[PDB]
């Protein structure tokens, strides 16, 4: 995000297509994106994992 703000406000060449920056962004973003979708999965696994034993008497 800082890199992108630098491009927009200071006129730098970070994500220029000629510079191989179209796919730099995708790598950097998808390194975040998928762990992000696993951040909002595991705690809600734990909630149901806590709830199941109580109502099953087991």
């Amino acid at each position: 995000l800082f890199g992108l703000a630098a491009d927009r406000h200071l006129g730098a060449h970070i994500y220029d297509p000629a510079n191989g920056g179209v796919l730099l962004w995708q790598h950097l973003f998808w390194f975040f994106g998928h762990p992000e979708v696993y951040i909002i999965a595991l705690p809600f696994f734990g909630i149901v994992s806590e709830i199941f034993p109580v109502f099953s008497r087991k």
């Binding site: 060449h13 220029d16 297509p17 000629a18 191989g20």
Partner: protein, 301 residues
Amino acid sequence: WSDALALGWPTGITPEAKLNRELWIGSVIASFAVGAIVWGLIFWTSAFHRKKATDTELPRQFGYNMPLELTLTVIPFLIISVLFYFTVVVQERMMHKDPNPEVVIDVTAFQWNWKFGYQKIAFADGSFDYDGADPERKEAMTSRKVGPIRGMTPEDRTYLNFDKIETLGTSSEIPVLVLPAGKRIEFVLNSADVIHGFWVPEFLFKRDVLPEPKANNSDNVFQVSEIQQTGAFVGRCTEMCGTFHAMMNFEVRVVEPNDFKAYIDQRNAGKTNAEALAAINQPPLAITTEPFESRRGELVP
């Protein structure tokens, strides 16, 4: 029945599409199997294992089973292994790129429309040769003391390709690409501004049109082995590109091999697209899509 287990894929018009459809159907079946198994297991315990009226003495407190957690961790590995094998087998086929194609197309995507250019034609029967490359016009895109990126400014546009025959789309006319049937086809993709999406649903395929494919280490050229159906098929953009992302469709019209030469000759004479299709007893405008209304919407006088 392939009309219910394909979940609504179109039938292929190319060998690769037909091969891909088989893998899709097989995968759908193999997923519904495990879905049914697990749903049955969930339903079984929710209908029989319940609290009885005459029920005391809390049930058996078992929570470990060693020779069952090692068994149920092996079957999914074997399931995924075969799927991986078939995936590899199919994916290697869809990207072959035979050295000698029979027609090369230069596809360029700009801001909310298309342009198609016939690079070269070389039939296998030695009955038609044409070379449409235009380097003189290509030379007029060059920019330069030193330049920012590799000794040039971002305003280079050298990577684009220009040809003698080019169909151009407008805001009031859908661009139509004309191809022969039963022939090997190239597609070489390049973009002027941003990323676009090349999708023809009947091909069961799509590829991103990038502003610098070479500099970004990404293949921007695919082949079709042959097409065995004459007619008109739709294509549309499948990558977010701005306000008019949803309004830059196109059409592909496949005709008989002999009609292709007549169309090419008509275009060589100086006729437009609409004046060439009419010359080979074909509708001039698109029949799968029509131009969008230029107005903003229905709240405007």
